[PDB]
């Protein structure tokens, strides 16, 4: 189909936004690699999105482990022979007052979100550099990445770091290798996990509703299209206007 | 579908304006292009029209509120609806801030900032009275949120337009379900202003090593108006190959 | 060196303008305050003047380029120099964007954006002719870089001023050594859900704002250029996740 | 509340900006604690900065080690009985193309700059919470923290994370404890030693010169003064206008 012969890797692709993006790329005929930490969820996701035999590759791995990343790259290269797009979506988040956050809790989020995104990006980038592939990277961030994230200080710091990495790689690798690097910052999206009623935040969104995984997937698809080839080093926000000041 | 929609593009007879008009027309929308000169409007129409009467040319000035109401009336009478407004009409040139005439400064503030407000408010009120969930796209520049040396007039005006964009996304998004966003293009071929050492140097300044195109800009505006994009509101989408970012540490 | 300096504060007869004027006069500078109404200027003068001839009141409109040149002539004749310009003259009120009259929108753009440009260009040219390394401080608002629901006129105007601030910081900083910066105040003294909205749990004060403007004009702050210093107790930041 | 009665901690206080800040606070009469990894540098800085015996406390410690941090707080509390200000300055930075950066290299910068700043801030904050002290935190960032940092991707990410932390703590702790948290972003400063011609750098600064440690010190001192009590959750840039676009 439209994305046929392209190979897309989505970390954290067995649930939520990751799986919504995975669904769209598979419907457009691309080969999709989804990663996760649990076998069962990956199998389920694969059964839900696979359009033809061999289209989807599930990889049980940890983005914090550089050996796992290299093994995944070798496995994909052997099965499909190329990698076109990397979407760094694997994340970990929960609320905790900053004073009460354990050192291990802080470390775990920085490790999965910031470090794991860098490990995946550098390893995939090096693969593209060696093969002369003009790849595309999309990093999932949050609107609190450029502001305050009260109650989620670990995620706010990690995602801010990811946003800086996004812009830095867009300049360095855009120039030296023609690799495009961008981010997406979603607002509240229906059908996603986490940790007095919802109308408390649906109200905070000017458009008065939650976004959908299909809408996020449409943005990801547009960013990977030939039309969008000049978009580089930006963060596309999709939050119905939530992050803006709602009163004067 | 896009086939039934009506799109207004101010300054639509040349440059990015015409690139956007070309795309919406190929997708079958009715397109209204505005401009100050009759000749350029007729040239653009002939070039982009897919079928008789698809394109409506309106010779007008975005600084004139009477021109804006006349245009709305004419469109409503002819097509019976308005779905999308793209505020593109612009004016720009280089001048050191201390040398800029009061008339030069005023003219750019009036066309870019005031004209965008006049058009947006008039169209918004038309949508409000008819219960239409419209969409507005404002064309800004990457210097709108930083410094614009040599183009202080445009930097100020476009910064005002960006603030307006975000403010209307909140006010109208909430009260009427009207979406408002902006596009910040980088250097785009076939859109030269007034003003090669610095020429090839500016291409060097773009990480991707090339100029953007009006067709790429048109594809972003088209995506922003699609049903898939319905949750995008109050943002500025930059399309500049990474140019506005720091190029060295 | 403050003793030998001349500071111009537009809209200096009330509120923040008066707070700034009070501090600069206490530090011994000559202060020029502008305003539209005679009696308010006369009251402000009596309140802040520390010695005879310290304060020059000028009844003028920042939208009038002829008024600006007359003021510059008058200042130059009386004091012989101008060191600092604070563009504070502002106008503001709440109104839904779709209800705002063309005259209402135009008046705010004219006073805030155009007036700041007219004053800044006229003073810049004066400094350019005399080789003076001046300092400009523009008063903006935290909604200048975000949305300002209900105050779209002021948000647009202030955002324009912020862009002008950064642009002149580059052009004039490099060519003439003139520094240009902005201050963004939060809610300032002179129902309480907005006090709750401020992490520090209170309103700011005009004395605090004046202390920031004073620091920005000091020799210690000579490398600060093209930035916006916000003083709002943390209010503009997201208060929830 | 008078500076003469205050205790100021400056990590990385034995050289460069840290020492410039140390010099100013000591000159105003505060007790100053400077941290560093080398005994000799610490003793040299102490001799240079101290106005009276016992005014300066040097602490040889690693900001990445939470035990070192805990021991330092005990030592200061025992000697001085209070802590008023924390300046997170310790940092590590060098140039390296993103694709050539080692995993250890990346990890070390994130650890020292981002994690170390969180460890010190959380530990000192907890100390302040226990004692009811309305403390003040200043984090040293850089202007590439909110943009691209080509060649310094590690520091750009770490510093972006520090900036997010700064804003997040200003909200959470400003509200719950009256603790202020702000950042400073310096431009190029003479006498600071991080790892073509230098006239290129001064040329990129509109003001056409480098900043000084004494200027940076004045900004830090202003931010800690009583008149700056309402400044919270912001980043004060001191770079001569360098980070702005220099041409259309």
Confirm or reject contact between D151 and chain A (CB < 8 A): yes
Report the residue of chain C nearest A151, measured CA to CA. C241
Pairing of strands A136-140, B84-87: unpaired
* Phi, psi dihedral angles at B96 (to 5 degrees): -60, 140
Q: What is the DSSP letter of A189?
A: B
Question: What gap in Å lies between CA D194 and CA B17, rounded to an integer?
Answer: 48
A25 in Cβ contact with A17 (< 8 Å):
no
Cβ of B249 within 8 Å of Cβ of D150? The answer is yes
Which residues partner with C137 through β-bridges? Answer: C86, C181
Half-sphere exposure of B63 (CA within 13 A, CB side): 12
Nearest by CB: B143 against D148, D151, D248: D248
Closest CA to D180 of C202, A143, A96, A145: C202
Burial of C216 (0-12, 13-18, 19+ CB in 10 A): buried
- Residue D61: CB partners within 8 Å, gap ≥ 6? D35, D36, D37, D68, D69, D71, D72
Cβ of A164 within 8 Å of Cβ of D151? The answer is no
Pairing of strands A136-140, A85-88: parallel
In chain D, the N- to C-terminal Cα span, in Å, equals 48
The catalytic residue among C118, C143, C215, C223 is: C143
Q: For residue D203, what are the CA distances in angstroms to B147, B196, C133, C163, C235? A: 17, 22, 18, 22, 37
Count of C-beta atoms within a 10 Å radius of residue D64: 16
Most A CBs within 10 Å, among D157, D159, D174, to test the A interface? D157
Cβ of A148 within 8 Å of Cβ of C237? The answer is yes
The residue behind tokens 């060097």 is: B204
Strand ranges (E), C30-82: 30-35, 55-59
Domains and CATH numbers, chain C: 1-241 (3.40.50.720)
Nearest by CB: C241 against A150, A241, A247: A150
The residue behind tokens 């000799």 is: D40
Q: For residue A226, what are the CA distances in angstroms to A132, A230, B47? A: 18, 9, 25
Question: What gap in Å lies between CA A135 and CA C119, rounded to an integer?
Answer: 51
In chain B, residues with a C-beta closer than 8 Å to the C-beta of C65 are: 102
Question: What gap in Å lies between CA D205 and CA C138, rounded to an integer?
Answer: 21
Question: What gap in Å lies between CA B55 and CA B31, rounded to an integer?
Answer: 5
In chain C, residues with a C-beta closer than 8 Å to the C-beta of B117 are: 105, 156
Cβ of C241 within 8 Å of Cβ of A149? The answer is yes
Most C CBs within 10 Å, among B163, B234, B244, to test the C interface? B163
Closest CA to A228 of B231, C2, B219: B219
Burial of D7 (0-12, 13-18, 19+ CB in 10 A): buried
Give residues after which chain B gaps, C-N over 2.5 angstroms: 195
Half-sphere exposure of A216 (CA within 13 A, CB side): 30
Nearest by CB: D174 against C177, C199, C212: C199
Write the Ramachandran bin of D128: left for phi over 0, alpha for psi from -120 to 50, otherwise beta: alpha
Pairing of strands B55-59, B84-87: unpaired
- Residue C163: CB partners within 8 Å, gap ≥ 6? B143, B144, B145, B146, B147, B148, B152, B155, B156, B158, B159, B160
Cβ of C148 within 8 Å of Cβ of B163? The answer is yes
Structure tokens at B50: 């897919």
Give residues after which chain D gaps, C-N over 2.5 angstroms: 195
Confirm or reject contact between A27 and chain B (CB < 8 A): no
In chain B, residues with a C-beta closer than 8 Å to the C-beta of D247 are: 149-150, 198
Specify the length of chain A in residues.
248
Laid out side by side, the sheet with A180-186 consists of A56-60, A31-36, A7-10, A85-88, A136-140, A180-186, A235-238
Closest CA to C200 of D233, D2, D223: D233
Structure tokens at A93: 């988040």
- Residue C140: CB partners within 8 Å, gap ≥ 6? C158, C161, C162, C165, C182, C183, C184, C228
B239 in Cβ contact with B216 (< 8 Å):
yes
D119 in Cβ contact with A103 (< 8 Å):
yes
DSSP string, B100-160: --HHHHHHHIIIIIIHHHHHHHHHHHHHHHHT---EEEEE--GGGGS--TT-HHHHHHHHH
Cβ of C225 within 8 Å of Cβ of D211? The answer is no
Which residues partner with A182 through β-bridges? Answer: A138
DSSP string, A67-100: HHHHHHHHHHHHHHS---EEEE---------GGG
Please report how the helices D39-49 and D16-27 are oriented relative to each other, as an axis angle in degrees rounded to 10: 40
Nearest by CB: C226 against D211, D231, D241: D241
Confirm or reject contact between C96 and chain A (CB < 8 A): no
Confirm or reject contact between D212 and chain C (CB < 8 A): yes
CA A56 to chain centre: 17
A10 in Cβ contact with A18 (< 8 Å):
yes
C3 in Cβ contact with C79 (< 8 Å):
no
Question: What gap in Å lies between CA D162 and CA D91, rounded to an integer?
Answer: 11
D224 in Cβ contact with D138 (< 8 Å):
yes
Closest CA to C25 of C59, C56, C60: C56
Q: What is the DSSP letter of B2?
A: G
Give the C window 125-144 contacts with B, CB below 8 Å.
Answer: 125, 128, 143-144
Torsion of CA A121, A122, A125, A129, to 10 degrees: 180
Confirm or reject contact between B149 and chain C (CB < 8 A): yes
Cβ of A248 within 8 Å of Cβ of C94? The answer is yes
Report the residue of chain C nearest B157, measured CA to CA. C160
C87 in Cβ contact with C180 (< 8 Å):
no
Question: What gap in Å lies between CA C41 and CA C11, rounded to an integer?
Answer: 9
Q: For residue A105, what are the CA distances in angstroms to A95, A113, A115, D16, D237? A: 11, 12, 14, 33, 32
In chain D, residues with a C-beta closer than 8 Å to the C-beta of C231 are: 230-231, 234
A18 in Cβ contact with A35 (< 8 Å):
no
Closest CA of chain B from D199, distance in Å? 15
The residue behind tokens 């027309």 is: B25
Collapsed DSSP state (helix, strand, coil) of residue C147: coil
Cβ of C149 within 8 Å of Cβ of A243? The answer is no
Count of C-beta atoms within a 10 Å radius of residue A58: 20
Count of C-beta atoms within a 10 Å radius of residue A34: 29
Maximum distance among all alpha carbons in chain A? 57
In chain B, residues with a C-beta closer than 8 Å to the C-beta of D147 are: 245-246
Cβ of D95 within 8 Å of Cβ of B151? The answer is no
DSSP string, D78-106: HHHS---EEEE---------GGG--HHHH
The residue behind tokens 């805990």 is: D70
Confirm or reject contact between B186 and chain A (CB < 8 A): yes
Which residues partner with C33 through β-bridges? Answer: C9, C57
- Residue A174: CB partners within 8 Å, gap ≥ 6? A180, A181, A232, A233, B207, B208, B241, B242
């Amino acid at each position: 189909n439209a994305m046929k012969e392209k190979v897309v890797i989505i970390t954290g692709g067995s649930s939520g936004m990751g799986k919504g993006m995975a669904t769209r790329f598979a419907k457009e005929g691309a080969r999709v690699v989804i990663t996760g930490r649990t076998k069962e969820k990956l199998e389920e996701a694969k059964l839900e999105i696979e359009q033809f035999p061999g289209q989807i590759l599930t990889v049980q791995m940890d983005v914090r482990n550089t050996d796992d990343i290299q093994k995944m790259i070798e496995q994909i290269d052997e099965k499909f022979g190329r990698i076109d797009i990397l979407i760094n979506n694997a994340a970990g988040n929960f609320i905790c007052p900053a004073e009460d956050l354990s050192v291990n809790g802080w470390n775990s989020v920085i490790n999965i979100v910031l470090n794991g995104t860098f490990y995946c990006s550098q390893a995939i980038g090096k693969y593209w550099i060696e093969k002369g592939i003009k790849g595309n990277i999309i990093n999932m961030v949050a609107t609190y990445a450029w502001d305050a994230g009260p109650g989620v200080i670990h995620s706010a710091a990690a995602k801010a770091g990811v946003l800086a990495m996004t812009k830095t790689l867009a300049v360095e690798w855009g120039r030296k290798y023609g690799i495009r690097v961008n981010a997406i910052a979603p607002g509240p999206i229906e059908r996603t996990g986490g940790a007095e009623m919802a109308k408390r935040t649906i109200q905070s969104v000017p458009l008065g509703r939650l976004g959908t995984p299909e809408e996020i997937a449409g943005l990801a698809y547009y960013l990977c299209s030939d039309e969008a080839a000049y978009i580089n080093g930006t963060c596309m926000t999709m939050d119905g206007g939530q992050h803006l000041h709602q009163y004067p």
